[PDB]
Copies of this chain bind each other. A is one copy, B any other.
Amino acid sequence: SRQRKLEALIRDPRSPINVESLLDGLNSLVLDLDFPALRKNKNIDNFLNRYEKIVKKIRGLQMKAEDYDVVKVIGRGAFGEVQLVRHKASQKVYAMKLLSKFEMIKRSDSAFFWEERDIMAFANSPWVVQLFYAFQDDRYLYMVMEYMPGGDLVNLMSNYDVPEKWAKFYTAEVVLALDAIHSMGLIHRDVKPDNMLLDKHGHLKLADFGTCMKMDETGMVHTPDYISPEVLKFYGRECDWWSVGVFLYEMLVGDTPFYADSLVGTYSKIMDHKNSLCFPEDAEISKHAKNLICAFLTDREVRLGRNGVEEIRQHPFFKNDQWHWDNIRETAAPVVPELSSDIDSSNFDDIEDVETFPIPKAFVGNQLPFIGFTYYR
């Protein structure tokens, strides 16, 4: 039936015409028309009068920023911040990412959040931070995610001298996490320890999917210290595997392989990786660890990971007496976080602390790029 086919489209949570997206369309239409200049048009003024009471009722019922208490700012980004929040009714703690609609439109970057929201909402993977809710108001997009109290791998590296047994565990967990992202047809493009978070048990999850891109049928897609040579000079999955080599080097050596005083010096060192990569003589690194770093830090054509993840899995570096690839996330992590409460943000450094869209004379549609963002798990 045509009515059955149409009702199936609205029930689908991945559908652009689900009830949440249809409510976004109505909310956005009201937001973009409720201006004194536009209200001079009888069509616009009468429509706003008809939908005024129901839209105000809907606004009070739907999820909003006022349903959460902001505890602390635990992160900052180009377009907003990440807050540690507590839901006022349920008393449950989450991490909430905010994205400024004004900054996203002004800096012509207003489409990256679709894949970010979808990866977190629909991955169903223990390696990806879960999104519970996605909602919005006139100024921001909000993403309510699981809070990772263990902090990131930048914080871990600065508080510990990482032994090779630990480095082996974290690299293996990054490998499985990137294999999960790659299996969903995506390339991360920003693999760095700042985006590798640890949960309450010390296990890894990836976060910040703002650079993720869906790869085409060929498996292709059209940060200075972690950027690969091919992006500096049309990239595939092995672009993410470069960053894993840089990460394993930073963990074992204590410094980045292509560190330099200037940004141009660092770029020059990455282009010259065939001669600029060298392990310090004091370095306490095994032959297998140097071999694995070197297999990742090569030109894209011969790089480890180009032919999937099976070649990475069988590398001799990963041989150990604690875990297997099928059970690594259910074994004891090297560092188990010592938390004093559900809002303990001691594994996060303190963050140091406004503009709106101009009132329009004619219809501009600033809310239109955000229709369909709302999602409730």
**Shortest Cβ distance from residue A296 to the other chain B in the assembled complex, whole angstroms:** 37
Known: A57-B9, A364-B43. A25 touches B16 (CB 8 A): no
How far is A365 from B362 in the complex, measured between Cα atoms in Å? 12
How far is A51 from B22 in the complex, measured between Cα atoms in Å? 12
Q: Does A314 contact B (CB under 8 A)?
A: no
What per-residue 1/0 map shows which CB atoms of A357-369 lie under 8 Å from chain B?
0000011111011
Beta-carbon contact of A19 and B19 below 8 Å: yes
Out of B19, B25, B62, which one reaches A25, CB within 8 Å? B25
Known: A22-B26, A29-B29. A371 touches B16 (CB 8 A): no
Beta-carbon contact of B43 and A6 below 8 Å: no
Closest residue of chain B to A372 (Cβ to Cβ) is B50
Give the residues in chain B near A108, CB-CB below 8 Å. 42
Q: Does A41 contact B (CB under 8 A)?
A: yes
Chain A interface residue count, Cβ-Cβ cutoff 8 angstroms: 43
Known: A17-B26, A25-B22, A25-B26. A43 touches B365 (CB 8 A): yes
Beta-carbon contact of A365 and B41 below 8 Å: yes
Within 8 A of B (CB), among A321-377: 362-366, 368-369, 371-372, 376
- A contacts with B: majority SS: helix
Assembly of this chain: how many copies? Answer: 2
Q: Does A158 contact B (CB under 8 A)?
A: no
Beta-carbon contact of B54 and A369 below 8 Å: no
Beta-carbon contact of A10 and B3 below 8 Å: no
Out of B29, B46, B51, B366, which one reaches A43, CB within 8 Å? B366
Give the residues in chain B near A58, CB-CB below 8 Å. 6, 9, 17
Beta-carbon contact of B16 and A19 below 8 Å: no
How far is A110 from B49 in the complex, measured between Cα atoms in Å? 14
Within 8 A of B (CB), among A259-289: none
Beta-carbon contact of B6 and A61 below 8 Å: yes
Give the residues in chain B near A54, CB-CB below 8 Å. 9, 15-17
Q: Does A184 contact B (CB under 8 A)?
A: no
Binding site for B on A (CB under 8 A): 2-3, 5-6, 9-10, 15-17, 19, 22-23, 25-26, 29, 33, 41-44, 46-47, 50-51, 54, 57-58, 61-62, 105, 108, 110-111, 362-366, 368-369, 371-372, 376
Query: Which are the 8 A-B pairs with shortest beta-carbon distances?
Result: A363-B363, A22-B22, A47-B368, A43-B365, A6-B61, A2-B61, A43-B368, A25-B26
